[PDB]
Structure 1
Amino acid sequence: KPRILNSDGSSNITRLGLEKRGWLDDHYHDLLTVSWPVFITLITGLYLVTNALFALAYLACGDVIENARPGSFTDAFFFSVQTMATIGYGKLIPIGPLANTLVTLEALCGMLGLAVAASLIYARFTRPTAGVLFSSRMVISDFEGKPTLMMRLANLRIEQIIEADVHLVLVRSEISQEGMVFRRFHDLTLTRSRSPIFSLSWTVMHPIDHHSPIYGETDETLRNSHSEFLVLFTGHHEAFAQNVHARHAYSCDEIIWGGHFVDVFTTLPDGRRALDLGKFHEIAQHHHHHH
C-alpha cells in the first residue's frame, strides 16, 4: 500500500488544478526557503538588474548624465549604483529634469530596497529549525505491566527547548453506523505529553489500555486499516528565543513489536556521565529458536 503521509509528516495527497496564490506567501518561499548563498544571489541579481535598467532608462534620455560618456551603459550603470546606494560621489550628477526626477525615484527605490531587504533578512533569521531527531522506528513492548506504543526524540543542540509538547496521533480508515467509511485521527494519551525542559532524550509512551484506539490490535489489523502514526513536536527554544516545530510519520511496518530502545544515557565514568545518540535508533529484540 502507498504512504498517505511521508516520513517527514508531509501529505502525499494530490491537489486539484489551478486556483489560488498569495504574496506574503509568494514573496516568501522562493525567497526564504532557499539557502543563504542562494538568497544572496537572488538579491544580488535583483540588485544589478534594477541598476542596469535605470541605467538604460538614463541613457534613454540622451547625453544627460554630466561627466559620463555618450551612450555608454558602463557609465550610467555606475551612476545608478552611485545614485541608488545613495552614495552620490557628485562627479557624475544628474542633468536637467528627467534625470534628477528619475533620481528622486531610484534612491527612493534603494530605500525600500533596504527596508524590504531588511524585513526579509529578519523573517529568515527567525524561522528557526527545531533540531529534533526522531527515532526511525516505533515499538510496542511492556512497560509497567502494559503493552506500550513508544518512540523517542532527541535534541541535536546544546541549547534547551522549554515547554515541549508532543502529540502522537493514530490515523486510520474507519466505518460508521451509517456505513460511511472515513479517515480518522486519534489523540493517543501519552503517559506524558508536556515536558518542561527538553534537553537530551525523551521517550514518548502510549499505554495500550482498554481505553486505547489500538487495544487488542495486531500488525495485521493495523495494516488492514492502513494505520499510520503522526508525531508533532513543539517547544520554545532558548537558542533563538523563539518557537520551534518538528514532525515525523510512521507506518505500520515501522513498528517493531517486542522491541526496546537501548539506553542512550550510557554513563561511562573515566571522565563523566554522558548521552550517546549513536545508539538512538538501536532497538533490542528477542529472537526465537529456529528448528
Structure 2
Amino acid sequence: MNVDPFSPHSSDSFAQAASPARKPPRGGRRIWSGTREVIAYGMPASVWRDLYYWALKVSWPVFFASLAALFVVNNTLFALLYQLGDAPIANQSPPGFVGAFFFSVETLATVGYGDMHPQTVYAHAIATLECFVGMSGIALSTGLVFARFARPRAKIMFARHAIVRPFNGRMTLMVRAANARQNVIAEARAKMRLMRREHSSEGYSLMKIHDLKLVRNEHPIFLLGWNMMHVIDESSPLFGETPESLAEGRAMLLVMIEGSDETTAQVMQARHAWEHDDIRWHHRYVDLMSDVDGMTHIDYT
C-alpha cells in the first residue's frame, strides 16, 4: 500500500489511446521507407544495409513472416539444386522435388533424421553446402533478433503544442514531457532555429540558436512528469518572439530529452521539433487540471 505503486489497481489505463490502437501507427517521421533518413537517401551503396534498417523497425510481425518467406525461397533454391542432374536424392515419402523440399527443410534448418540418403557425393556436397548456409542463416537470424531487442524505444518524444503563458509575472513557454516507458532519469537540452531578418541565406544561413533557458531553471531529475520552461524577459532571442516575427523566420523549437533508462543502461535520446505556428497562446494555461480532488497523478490525452 505505497503512495504511488497502489495506482495500477485503479481503473483502466487505456486513456492514452484505446480506439487509435486499431488506427494505423504514427508514421509522420517514421513512415514505411527504405531510407534511413531523408538525407541518407543520397548514399547508393547503402542498398544492402537498407535491408538491415528495414529488418530493424517494422520487424514485430513482419520479421517472422519475412524469415518464413526467405526460408521458402532458399529451400526451393536447394530443391532446384537437387534436380541439378547428379544422381537424385529420392526415397523420400513424397516423390519428386516435393520430397527434396521435405528433407531439405531439415537440412537448411536443423538436421534430417530418416532421410539418410547422401548416396551420391555430388548430392552430398550440395547438402553439405546447404548445411553450412543454413546454420549460418540461423546465426544471422538470431543475431538480428537480439539486435532488435537491443534497440530501445523512445516514446518519450511525445507530441504536444508549445504554450506561451505568463508565469511569476514573466512571460514563459512550456513543453509537455512523456512518461510513456521507463523514463525515470532523463535530462533535456533546448535548441531553437531562427532566421535573421537580413538572412537572405547567402551568408551564415540559418542562425543556430542556443536556448538553454528551457531547461535552465527546469533541470528535470525528478522526471516522473516534468515540464520544460524558459523565460522570455531575460536576454534571449525569444524577446522579439512576437508571432509575426516568428512566422517570417522558420522559427523552429527543438527539444531533446535523454538519460539512462535504469534498465540496461543505454542513453536513450529523443528528437522533437515544433513549428512556429505550433506555439499556442497563453489561453492553454488551463493545463490538464487534475479532475480527482487531492494531489493525484493522472495520465489522460
Number of matched residues? 267
In the other structure, the counterpart of 1:182 is 205
CA 1:54–1:7 in 2, change beyond 3 Å: closer, same or farther? closer
Following superposition, the deviation at residue 91 of structure 1 comes to 3.1
The CA deviation at 1:265 is 6.9
Structure-2 change in CA distance of 1:173 and 1:108 (3 Å): same
Say which of 78, 87, 96 aligns to 2:102: 78
Corresponding letter in the other structure for 1:161: V
- Distance in 1, Cα, partners of 2:135 & 2:180: 40
CA distance in 2 between counterparts of 1:253 and 1:142 reads 18
Distance 1:125 1:96 in 2: 43
Check if 1:277 corresponds to 2:299: yes
Query: How far did 1:144 drift?
Result: 2.6
Q: TM-score, normalised by structure 1?
A: 0.78
Listed one character per residue, the Cα deviations across residues 251-271 of structure 1 (whole Å, up to 9, x for unaligned) are 2222123245445473735xx
- 1:172 equivalent in alignment to 2:197: no
CA distance in 1, matches of 2:162, 2:94: 73
Match of 2:117 among 70, 78, 93: 93
* 2:110 matches 1:68: no
Q: Residue 158 of structure 2 is aligned with which of 134, 149, 155?
A: 134
From the two aligned structures, give the one with the greater helix fraction. 2
> Runs in 1 of length 4+ with deviation above 6 angstroms?
176-179
CA RMSD after TM alignment: 3.3
Distance of 2:251 and 2:121 partners within structure 1: 72
Partner-residue secondary structure (3-state), 1:186: strand
Q: How many Å apart are 1:114 and its aligned residue?
A: 1.1
CA displacement, residues 55-107 of structure 1 (integer Å, 9 cap, x when unaligned) = 11012134432523797110111121122223221334222211111222111
Q: Using a 3 Å threshold, how does the CA distance of structure 1 residues 197 and 244 change in structure 2: closer, same or farther?
A: farther
Contact 1:137 1:254 survives alignment (8 Å):
yes
Q: Match for residue 60 of structure 2?
A: 36
Does residue 124 (structure 1) correspond to residue 130 (structure 2)? The answer is no
Residues of 1 paired with 2:221 and 2:108: CA distance?
50
- Hey, what's the Cα distance between the residues in 2 that align with 1:91 and 1:16? 49
The equivalent residue for 2:9 is none
Contact 2:87 2:123 in 1 (8 A): no
Distance of aligned partners of 1:8 and 1:165 in 2 relative to their CA distance in 1, 3 Å threshold? farther
| 2: CA distance, partners of 1:208 / 1:9 | 33
Q: Is the Cα contact below 8 Å between 2:89 and 2:100 reproduced in 1?
A: yes
Q: Give deviations 1:234-287, integer Å, cap 9, x for gaps.
A: 222235643323222212222123245445473735xx8532232x6xxxxxxx
* Mapping of residues 39-58 of structure 1, within 5 Å: 39-58=63-82
